[PDB]
Design a protein around this nucleic acid. Structure first.
Ligand SMILES: [Mg+2]
Ligand SMILES: [Mg+2]
Ligand SMILES: [Mg+2]
Ligand SMILES: [Mg+2]
Ligand SMILES: [Mg+2]
Ligand SMILES: [Mg+2]
Ligand SMILES: [Mg+2]
Ligand SMILES: [Mg+2]
Lengths: 4, 44, 223, 53, 109, 49, 49, 176
RNA sequence: GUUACAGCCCCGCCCCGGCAGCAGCAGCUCGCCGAAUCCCGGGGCCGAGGGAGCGAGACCCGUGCGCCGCGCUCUCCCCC
RNA sequence: GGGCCCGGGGGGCCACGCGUCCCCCGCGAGCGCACGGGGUCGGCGGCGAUGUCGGCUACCCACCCGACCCGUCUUGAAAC
RNA sequence: GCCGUCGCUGGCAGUCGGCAGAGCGAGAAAGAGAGUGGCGCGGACGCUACGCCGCGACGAGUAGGAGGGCCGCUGCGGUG
């Protein structure tokens, strides 16, 4: 979720 | 012998090899500059 | 779309970049570059119109067929291979040809062609070797060099230029020197020849052939 | 050993700890310091042959 | 025109004292009498050249009685400059003590 | 990251042995290293007799 | 290092399998937390549990 | 022990394993000449066992290290006290050598003992090695080099390049 | 006989008296090593196997460079 | 020295969203290069109908290395 | 590299196609589960299952044992  | 085979088994090997290459080249650059200064010092 | 950018990771050694993952992460500014989630042609006919299949099923099938190969990597075609040149072969170097009708003759190395073959010239007037391709494995690179840095080699002198054309027979068919080649030979020779004559006894050296004689051993002598 | 094993196994359990129960072969000796105490070691030499016949 | 090959001798096959490996030939090269001098000749082409009764096609020429078995130097042998060579066919024992051409290609110089 | 950790561990083991010896030599004593825990064994003889 | 990288083969289902991939080690010694060649080299070199 | 190559001089220090009777057993030192340190420790245990109630099982090596020659650029005379077994007895010898290193002198002793007495290295015990002044040397082979104005030629110099060339036109000259 | 018209060894104080250097391209005066190790090159022998798929999907019927491992660039904007 | 190489006042990190509570103080897209689950060229040259091309093996010959005559009884056979 | 033997008492009936949807080799038990409420008509080979396929190790042999012979001979029932 953080990466996107 | 095969670099990409090593990274498949030990990805950290790429870090160690990159560090060695950068360190060894840096240590060589010091010895020439040290040596060059000494030779110039002798010429004085 | 954006224009391609040159790689921000310089090559340290083959397969290893200069910068680590986090170093490249910053250099590429990925902290702000975040992103989140026919077979037929209709034709009229003189029914009214027909749907035409662009590719038709085979009209024949052999009794047996071979299976598909497994997939490999690193097996490029010849045109995509990297070309290598011995460090002792620089433009203006004198080379000794070792094979063919021109064996033993000393020639001037001009450039390495895209296929990797060398381009050389006698020049023709000195040893009757024209603009001709030669393979590097079959030449000895001597230590004698003229400076041909100011010589303008025509750009059409490419691999396709020197590729042999097939001749047919049913008696015999003879090769002919096209008038273009003669013109190209003179243009290149006129620039190299004056530079050869600048070095004393060099034009005579290029006229003379190489041979092994009594007591002469290649591993002992410098070329 | 069984009784020592059975005692230790029971005791260690009520202390929530692990204690070795299996024997082991004698391990290689571990690193240590040997103090000279300011005394040079006594030099030893082979003695000359003597026919004590 | 002149010679373009080094002079070698077919000294014998690879062997112990009582076993012979005919697929490897021991070559003696004129002027090469130490192992550190054989380095130039590794990988170079070698030719056993001979004549027969019947004519055979000549590349770039018309049929004649010359025949050749090609090979190449594979490694040094011993301390005194002998090299091992391998040919497309095992050399004939009648070739022992006779000339083996060693070509100057594949050039590495 | 395990390999990164082992690299550090191996270095400390290598450096620690040198530091123990140096401090014993300083005091005039002898540091005796631990007997090795590992051996590699090669059979150098055949199987006849 | 060199012994296990060049000439290291695992005994997997009683067969001699080259350790060409890390999953080979992990499936057999994973229960001991040995999941890569480096974990295998660290268990051998330091004579672990 | 095989006297392979040039020997090195090792300083080996050992002791009995500490026990409740003697928590700090005394330390023993030996001069060992051997090809490698592995042989050096082995010979130590062979010598102390002959002098003490000790052996590898009931003792340990405390320090093994090579003793370096202290004046490798100065010529010295070395006296060597050794004992050895012949085919029919044991004997004590005193021998002398000239060398730059003490381990070089000891190597000469092994080659010399092998040449002149057919004594294998396993039957030789080097008891003592000393550096000796020119005035205390005893063997005339060593004393003839105690001359400040020493001079001598090199008669009959034999051709050692006898196969380069193997065949020549001129005969060799031995006088130079 | 004891530094003189050569030198050698030793010892005390001189920051272990000070400077290079450092198991030394004075290419051999004497070692052991590499998580404290990397780069490049040369010669020889060999090429066993042959349907590994990828993505579009029930709004699509494509394409035979595909796994794992390592990278690059774009989906931002500037400068040389 | 060890403490994710503790706490305070030029160079590499397999750090890089956030609302927070607070210890402490679940699918982005493409594109490309490859030391990446065993070789390919999307590289070339010469020669060929009456004397030449290929034909392991087989017919004959030569050479180098090897090589004692089988069956049998037998501890042991090329066995005088 | 190739041949055979042994072992895995290993894999393959899933060739489940337009009544379609291609996967189950991967470090770490058990569902590519089922539901109830809040244009083209196309897609290689395979499977004598006594068959076919994969992976690893191994291979001396008299006396002697066992297996397999699409080895060979004569005659008989069937079949070609
Ligand atoms: Mg001729
Ligand atoms: Mg035996
Ligand atoms: Mg014979
Ligand atoms: Mg009989
Ligand atoms: Mg009898
Ligand atoms: Mg018999
Ligand atoms: Mg007899
Ligand atoms: Mg058998």
């Amino acid at each position: 979720r953080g990466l996107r | 012998k095969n670099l990409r085979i090593m990274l498949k088994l030990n990805p950290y090997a790429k870090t160690m090899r990159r560090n060695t290459i950068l360190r060894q080249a840096r240590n060589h650059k010091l010895r020439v500059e040290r040596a060059a200064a000494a030779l110039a010092a002798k010429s004085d | 779309k954006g224009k391609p950018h040159c790689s921000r990771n310089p090559v340290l050694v083959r397969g290893i970049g200069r910068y680590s993952r986090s170093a490249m992460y910053s250099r590429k500014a990925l902290y702000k570059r975040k992103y989140a989630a026919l077979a037929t042609v209709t034709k009229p006919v003189g029914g009214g119109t027909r749907v035409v299949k662009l590719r038709k099923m085979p009209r024949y099938y052999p009794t047996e067929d071979v299976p598909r190969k497994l997939l490999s990597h690193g097996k490029k075609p010849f045109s995509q291979h990297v070309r290598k040149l011995r460090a002792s072969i620089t433009p203006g170097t004198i080379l000794i040809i070792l094979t063919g009708r021109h064996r033993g003759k000393r020639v001037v190395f001009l450039k390495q062609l895209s296929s990797g073959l060398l381009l050389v010239t006698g020049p023709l007037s000195l040893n009757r070797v024209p603009l001709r391709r030669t393979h590097q494995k079959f030449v000895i690179a001597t230590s004698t060099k003229i400076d041909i840095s100011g010589v303008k080699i025509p750009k059409h002198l490419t691999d396709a230029y020197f590729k042999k054309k097939k001749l047919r027979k049913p008696e015999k068919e003879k090769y002919e020197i096209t008038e273009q080649r003669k013109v190209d030979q003179k243009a290149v020779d006129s620039q190299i020849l004056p530079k050869i004559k600048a070095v004393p006894q060099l034009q005579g050296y290029l006229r003379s052939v190489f041979a092994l004689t009594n007591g002469v051993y290649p591993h002992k002598l410098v070329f | 050993r069984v009784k020592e094993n059975d005692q230790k196994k029971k005791e260690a359990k009520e202390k929530g700890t692990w204690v070795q129960l299996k024997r082991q072969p004698a391990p290689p000796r571990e690193a240590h310091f040997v103090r000279t105490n300011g005394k040079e070691p006594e030099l030893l030499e082979p003695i000359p042959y003597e026919f004590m016949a | 025109s002149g010679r373009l090959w080094c002079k070698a001798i077919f000294a014998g096959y690879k062997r112990g004292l009582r076993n012979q490996r005919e697929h490897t030939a021991l070559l003696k090269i004129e002027g090469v009498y130490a192992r550190d001098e054989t380095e130039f000749y590794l990988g170079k082409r070698c030719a056993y050249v001979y004549k027969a009764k019947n004519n055979t096609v000549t590349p770039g020429g018309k049929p004649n009685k010359t025949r050749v078995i090609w090979g190449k130097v594979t490694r040094a042998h011993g301390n005194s400059g002998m090299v091992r060579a391998k040919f497309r066919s095992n050399l004939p024992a009648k070739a022992i003590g006779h000339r083996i051409r060693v070509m100057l290609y594949p050039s590495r110089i | 990251e395990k390999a990164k950790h082992y690299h550090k561990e191996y270095r400390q083991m290598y450096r620690t042995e040198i530091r123990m010896a140096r401090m014993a030599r300083k005091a005039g004593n002898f540091y005796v290293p631990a007997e090795p825990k590992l051996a590699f064994v090669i059979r150098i003889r055949g199987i006849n007799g | 290092n060199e012994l296990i990288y060049k000439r290291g083969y695992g005994k997997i289902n009683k067969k001699r399998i080259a350790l060409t991939d890390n999953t080979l080690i992990a499936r057999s010694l994973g229960k001991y937390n040995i999941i890569c060649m480096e974990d295998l080299i660290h268990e051998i070199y330091t004579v672990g549990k | 022990m095989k006297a392979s190559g040039t020997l090195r001089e090792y300083k080996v220090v050992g002791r009995c394993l500490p026990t409740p009777k003697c928590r700090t057993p005394p330390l023993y030192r030996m001069r060992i000449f051997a090809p490698n340190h592995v042989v050096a420790k082995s010979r130590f245990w062979y010598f102390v066992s002959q002098l003490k109630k000790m052996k590898k099982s009931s003792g340990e090596i405390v320090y093994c290290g090579q003793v370096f020659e202290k004046s490798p650029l100065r010529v010295k005379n070395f006296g060597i006290w050794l004992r050895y077994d012949s085919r029919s007895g044991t004997h004590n010898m005193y021998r002398e050598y000239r060398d730059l290193t003490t381990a070089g002198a000891v190597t000469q002793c092994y080659r010399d003992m092998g040449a002149r007495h057919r004594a294998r290295a396993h039957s030789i015990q080097i008891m003592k090695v000393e550096e000796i002044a020119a005035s205390k040397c005893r063997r005339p082979a060593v004393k003839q080099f105690h001359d400040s104005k020493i001079k001598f030629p090199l008669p009959h110099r034999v051709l050692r390049r006898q196969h380069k060339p193997r065949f020549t036109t001129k005969r060799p000259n031995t006088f130079f």
